[PDB]
Amino acid sequence: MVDAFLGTWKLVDSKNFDDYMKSLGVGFATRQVASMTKPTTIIEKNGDILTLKTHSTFKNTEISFKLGVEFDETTADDRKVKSIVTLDGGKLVHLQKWDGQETTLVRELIDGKLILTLTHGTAVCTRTYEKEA
Protein backbone atom coordinates (compact mmCIF):
# COMPACT_ATOMS: atom_id res chain seq x y z
CA MET A 1 0.00 0.00 0.00
CA VAL A 2 2.45 2.63 -1.38
CA ASP A 3 -0.29 4.37 -3.43
CA ALA A 4 -0.86 7.28 -0.98
CA PHE A 5 2.78 8.38 -1.44
CA LEU A 6 2.56 8.71 -5.22
CA GLY A 7 2.60 12.15 -6.81
CA THR A 8 4.41 15.46 -6.88
CA TRP A 9 5.39 17.05 -3.59
CA LYS A 10 6.94 20.48 -2.85
CA LEU A 11 8.99 21.41 0.26
CA VAL A 12 7.19 23.84 2.57
CA ASP A 13 9.11 23.49 5.92
CA SER A 14 12.58 22.34 7.03
CA LYS A 15 14.06 21.97 10.53
CA ASN A 16 17.71 21.15 11.27
CA PHE A 17 18.81 20.28 7.73
CA ASP A 18 22.11 22.08 8.31
CA ASP A 19 22.71 19.82 11.39
CA TYR A 20 22.07 16.73 9.21
CA MET A 21 24.31 17.89 6.36
CA LYS A 22 27.13 18.80 8.82
CA SER A 23 26.88 15.31 10.39
CA LEU A 24 27.33 13.76 6.86
CA GLY A 25 30.43 15.95 6.24
CA VAL A 26 28.87 18.25 3.61
CA GLY A 27 30.97 21.41 3.09
CA PHE A 28 29.82 24.81 4.20
CA ALA A 29 29.37 26.15 0.60
CA THR A 30 27.04 23.25 -0.38
CA ARG A 31 25.12 23.72 2.92
CA GLN A 32 24.53 27.38 2.05
CA VAL A 33 22.87 26.57 -1.30
CA ALA A 34 20.99 23.54 0.07
CA SER A 35 19.54 25.61 2.97
CA MET A 36 17.80 27.93 0.42
CA THR A 37 16.55 25.28 -2.06
CA LYS A 38 12.87 24.05 -2.12
CA PRO A 39 13.01 20.72 -3.91
CA THR A 40 10.20 18.98 -5.77
CA THR A 41 9.94 15.22 -5.04
CA ILE A 42 8.09 13.01 -7.55
CA ILE A 43 7.17 9.43 -6.60
CA GLU A 44 5.93 7.16 -9.38
CA LYS A 45 5.21 3.46 -9.74
CA ASN A 46 5.26 1.02 -12.64
CA GLY A 47 4.30 -2.36 -11.28
CA ASP A 48 6.76 -3.37 -8.54
CA ILE A 49 9.23 -0.60 -9.57
CA LEU A 50 9.15 2.73 -7.73
CA THR A 51 10.93 5.80 -9.06
CA LEU A 52 11.80 8.71 -6.73
CA LYS A 53 12.96 11.92 -8.34
CA THR A 54 14.22 14.95 -6.40
CA HIS A 55 14.45 18.11 -8.54
CA SER A 56 15.85 21.49 -7.61
CA THR A 57 17.81 24.46 -8.94
CA PHE A 58 20.96 22.98 -7.26
CA LYS A 59 21.03 19.18 -7.67
CA ASN A 60 18.68 16.56 -9.32
CA THR A 61 18.60 12.91 -8.26
CA GLU A 62 16.66 9.86 -9.46
CA ILE A 63 16.50 6.33 -8.09
CA SER A 64 14.41 3.33 -9.18
CA PHE A 65 13.96 0.36 -6.84
CA LYS A 66 11.84 -2.52 -5.73
CA LEU A 67 10.72 -2.57 -2.12
CA GLY A 68 12.81 -4.95 0.00
CA VAL A 69 15.62 -5.34 -2.60
CA GLU A 70 19.01 -3.80 -1.98
CA PHE A 71 20.34 -1.36 -4.57
CA ASP A 72 23.42 0.77 -5.18
CA GLU A 73 22.82 4.53 -4.85
CA THR A 74 24.95 7.60 -5.37
CA THR A 75 23.52 10.35 -3.14
CA ALA A 76 23.23 14.13 -3.83
CA ASP A 77 26.37 14.66 -1.68
CA ASP A 78 28.32 12.01 -3.66
CA ARG A 79 28.22 9.16 -1.10
CA LYS A 80 28.20 5.65 -2.67
CA VAL A 81 25.79 3.69 -0.49
CA LYS A 82 23.94 0.37 -0.29
CA SER A 83 20.24 1.19 0.03
CA ILE A 84 17.01 -0.64 0.85
CA VAL A 85 13.49 0.82 0.94
CA THR A 86 10.71 -0.97 2.85
CA LEU A 87 7.19 -0.25 4.10
CA ASP A 88 7.07 -0.38 7.91
CA GLY A 89 3.96 0.65 9.83
CA GLY A 90 2.68 2.48 6.75
CA LYS A 91 5.93 4.51 6.52
CA LEU A 92 8.36 4.40 3.60
CA VAL A 93 11.74 3.66 5.28
CA HIS A 94 14.90 4.23 3.19
CA LEU A 95 18.11 2.90 4.88
CA GLN A 96 21.55 3.86 3.43
CA LYS A 97 24.72 2.07 4.53
CA TRP A 98 28.35 2.99 3.70
CA ASP A 99 31.73 2.64 5.50
CA GLY A 100 30.01 1.06 8.59
CA GLN A 101 27.72 4.16 8.94
CA GLU A 102 23.92 4.33 8.41
CA THR A 103 21.36 6.99 7.80
CA THR A 104 17.58 6.61 7.63
CA LEU A 105 15.13 8.63 5.53
CA VAL A 106 11.59 7.96 6.79
CA ARG A 107 8.52 9.24 4.94
CA GLU A 108 5.09 9.28 6.55
CA LEU A 109 1.75 10.86 5.63
CA ILE A 110 0.21 13.01 8.37
CA ASP A 111 -2.91 15.11 7.68
CA GLY A 112 -2.23 14.83 3.92
CA LYS A 113 1.35 16.16 4.19
CA LEU A 114 4.49 14.10 3.57
CA ILE A 115 6.91 14.29 6.53
CA LEU A 116 10.45 13.25 5.81
CA THR A 117 12.61 12.54 8.90
CA LEU A 118 16.40 12.27 8.27
CA THR A 119 18.61 10.75 11.03
CA HIS A 120 22.41 10.44 11.09
CA GLY A 121 24.44 10.21 14.27
CA THR A 122 22.68 12.49 16.77
CA ALA A 123 21.23 14.77 14.04
CA VAL A 124 17.49 14.64 13.29
CA CYS A 125 16.00 16.76 10.51
CA THR A 126 12.32 17.08 9.65
CA ARG A 127 11.15 18.21 6.22
CA THR A 128 7.58 18.80 5.32
CA TYR A 129 6.22 18.43 1.79
CA GLU A 130 2.82 19.39 0.41
CA LYS A 131 1.07 17.72 -2.53
CA GLU A 132 1.03 19.54 -5.91
CA ALA A 133 -2.21 18.91 -7.98
Ligand SMILES: CCCCCCCCCC(=O)O
Ligand atom coordinates in the same frame (compact mmCIF):
# COMPACT_ATOMS: atom_id res chain seq x y z
C1 LIG B 1 23.31 18.19 -0.43
C2 LIG B 1 23.02 17.38 0.85
C3 LIG B 1 22.25 16.13 0.51
C4 LIG B 1 21.87 15.30 1.73
C5 LIG B 1 21.14 14.04 1.36
C6 LIG B 1 19.79 14.12 0.66
C7 LIG B 1 18.75 14.79 1.50
C8 LIG B 1 17.36 14.81 0.88
C9 LIG B 1 16.48 15.89 1.34
C10 LIG B 1 15.10 15.95 0.75
O1 LIG B 1 14.73 15.08 -0.07
O2 LIG B 1 14.35 16.89 1.04
